[PDB]
Amino acid sequence: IMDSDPRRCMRHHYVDSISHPLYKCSSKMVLLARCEGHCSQASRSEPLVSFSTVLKQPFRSSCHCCRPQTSKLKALRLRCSGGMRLTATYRYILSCHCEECNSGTETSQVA
């Protein structure tokens, strides 16, 4: 049974202390996850052939990037000087995967 390459895309845990960069708030330690690794697929770039006007885009390319596949929204609550409470929002990455560079994730909701 072979262990796999450790340098591949996978998740890592780390701790950080959250503080507001302006308000005098009470800092707070939080457990976070990140993604990092070398995706297995090579990245490519090929020329495209045009018969029309010189192409605005002369290449077709593929490139895989280690990125969150699933995550979970989480809120944090900070206690600040005036007894005013300040809430911090972030995403806790659950799993990581290799996906295409140009692909993205929309935030805008649809009617």
Partner: peptide, 7 residues
Amino acid sequence: XEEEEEE
């Protein structure tokens, strides 16, 4: 598409 989902 390359692994982690946490108690």
